[PDB]
Design a protein around this ligand. Structure first.
Ligand SMILES: CNC[C@H](C[C@H]1CCCOC1)NC(=O)N1CCC[C@@H]([C@@H](OCCNC(=O)OC)c2cccc(Cl)c2)C1
Ligand SMILES: *[C@@H]1O[C@H](CO)[C@@H](O[C@@H]2O[C@H](CO)[C@@H](O)[C@H](O)[C@H]2NC(C)=O)[C@H](O)[C@H]1NC(C)=O
Ligand SMILES: [Cl-]
Ligand SMILES: [Cl-]
Ligand SMILES: [Cl-]
Ligand SMILES: [Cl-]
Length: 337
């Protein structure tokens, strides 16, 4: 077995990254987020009523136009930090890359306007473990591993920084390996705490020189479906004070002129310092002192058993190419380029 597939990703404003999959024969394509913090695959269903304006605005899967579709109809409900989708299970072949696998996924027939009217993508391909899958549906990567087609039992993420270029690649996911065009040096591997969750230990978070946060250790989820870095309300309040940031309704901001001279924030992982500077974490839409600029960091209280935990989302992954290694239960980071 020696295949390594690769899916190009569109980068929308540094907050949503999504690629295409095809479902059925002939394929119906969908825009989907590849999410290490969840484990189910779903797309909107042709059976989704118009009453759901999010189903009006996205691509719908029509079972009856595919010959490889296999009925199941068991009910499915998925709860995310953003809201809940609901529908039922269907089997069909899914193409990502590269690779064709037979999969159980959700056809979604309830999709709330909040917040899917803001989703540039249609559905989600969860990349987490079966342990976290609702209905214990076998996850796509498990089904792929079963095929024995992959060079190595790993996948990795490159997320680029938004750009004005017509060209210039938003991001890329590799299945089976990592792409040395988008990282320098070698991977520093850190071991999962346990199989079941893409989560490692974190020994501290510092702002400036001082170990401000997580001073006695804490957890970090490595969450490719998260836009920002997240911590618990209690940590984030502390961090945001340190930066002089202001809490608004949807974000934290600073005066744009102040952004560039804000302290670095470092994350202490597997014995090393992973530093994002204020250029990595302020959306500097101008440098005016009369404007407010958003930070790519916010509070999310992730409930037990998976939290309390930080999550290292795109703000972090932009700087560090990330490889998810299911064979050895570990995560590798190297500098992205
Ligand atoms: C379990 N993993 C973390 C979850 C996963 C999301 C998958 C899709 C449905 O929601 C959950 N993400 C979050 O909790 N986020 C915080 C709130 C907004 C999300 C944000 O997701 C863009 C896709 N994520 C991305 O490109 O990461 C690089 C979003 C923004 C606007 C509308 C929607 Cl519907 C979702 C990010
Ligand atoms: C739809 O999916 C459900 C979920 O697995 C299937 O129900 C299982 O069927 C197997 C085989 O008959 C049983 O051993 C299990 O007891 C069932 N699981 C549950 C949770 O009930 C069902 O068979 C599928 N239907 C079709 C036709 O695909
Ligand atoms: Cl869930
Ligand atoms: Cl609201
Ligand atoms: Cl803390
Ligand atoms: Cl940024």
């Amino acid at each position: 077995g020696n295949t390594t597939s690769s899916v190009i990703l569109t980068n929308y404003m540094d907050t949503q990254y999504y690629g295409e999959i095809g479902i059925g024969t002939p394929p119906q394509t969908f825009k989907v987020v590849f999410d290490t913090g969840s484990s189910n695959v779903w797309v909107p269903s042709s059976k989704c009523s118009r009453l759901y304006t999010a189903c009006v605005y996205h691509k719908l899967f029509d079972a009856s136009d595919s010959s490889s579709y296999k009925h199941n109809g068991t009910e499915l409900t998925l709860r995310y930090s953003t809201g809940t989708v609901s529908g039922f299970l269907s089997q069909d072949i899914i193409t990502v890359g590269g690779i064709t696998v037979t999969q159980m996924f959700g056809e979604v027939t309830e999709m709330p306007a909040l917040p899917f009217m803001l989703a540039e993508f249609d559905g989600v391909v969860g990349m987490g473990f079966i342990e976290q899958a609702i209905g214990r549906v076998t996850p796509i990567f498990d089904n792929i591993i079963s095929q024995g087609v992959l060079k190595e039992d790993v996948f990795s993420f490159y997320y680029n920084r938004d750009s004005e270029n017509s060209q210039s690649l938003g991001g890329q996911i590799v299945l089976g390996g990592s792409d040395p065009q988008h990282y320098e040096g070698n991977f520093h591997y850190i071991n999962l705490i346990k199989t079941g969750v893409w989560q490692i230990q974190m020994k501290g978070v510092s702002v400036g020189s001082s170990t401000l946060l997580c001073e006695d250790g804490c957890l970090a989820l490595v969450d490719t479906g998260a836009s920002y870095i997240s911590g618990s309300t209690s940590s984030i309040e502390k961090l945001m004070e340190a930066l002089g940031a202001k809490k608004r309704l949807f974000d934290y901001v600073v005066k744009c002129n102040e952004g560039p001279t804000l302290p670095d924030i470092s994350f202490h992982l597997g014995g090393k310092e992973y530093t994002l500077t204020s250029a990595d974490y302020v959306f500097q839409e101008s440098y005016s002192s009369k404007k407010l600029c958003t930070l790519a960091i916010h509070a999310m209280d992730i409930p037990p058993p998976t939290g309390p935990t930080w999550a290292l989302g795109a703000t972090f992954i932009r700087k560090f190419y990330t490889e998810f290694d299911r064979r050895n239960n570990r995560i590798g980071f190297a500098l992205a380029r």
